[PDB]
Amino acid sequence: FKDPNAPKRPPSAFFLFCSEYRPKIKGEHPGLSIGDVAKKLGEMWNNTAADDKQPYEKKAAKLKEKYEKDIAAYRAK
């Protein structure tokens, strides 16, 4: 009975980035703390050229156009 209404909203712009830059650092650092992981990721991200953030923000825009597509019927709380 998967209610078509009940949707899912995009995560954080940099969350989509974390998964990408998480193995690189954690790779050479198989002991990062959830704090470090997200902190450093935040640094590289923050440092990521605005033009390089395109794929990520753009991605969110793809599933977003899809989101609001059926939400018009769903609610908001």
Side-chain angles (χ1 to χ4, degrees):
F1 290 102
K2 211 179 202 331
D3 318 82
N5 289 83
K8 281 275 279 85
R9 328 193 351 277
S12 226
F14 127 124
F15 179 62
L16 308 171
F17 171 98
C18 156
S19 183
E20 168 50 56
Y21 282 87
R22 200 178 192 176
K24 309 285 178 197
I25 17 162
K26 192 81 167 287
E28 305 192 333
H29 293 270
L32 290 197
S33 63
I34 309 308
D36 199 273
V37 176
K39 257 69 196 66
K40 200 158 179 304
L41 283 168
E43 280 287 317
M44 278 172 303
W45 167 247
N46 274 199
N47 285 314
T48 303
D51 178 54
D52 283 46
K53 280 191 185 163
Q54 257 60 350
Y56 295 109
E57 79 192 86
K58 186 71 156 182
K59 194 169 192 178
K62 282 177 166 62
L63 76 99
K64 186 183 169 176
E65 282 187 82
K66 170 258 182 53
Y67 185 75
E68 289 202 83
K69 192 81 172 296
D70 278 64
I71 317 321
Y74 180 46
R75 70 183 166 159
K77 282 186 173 194

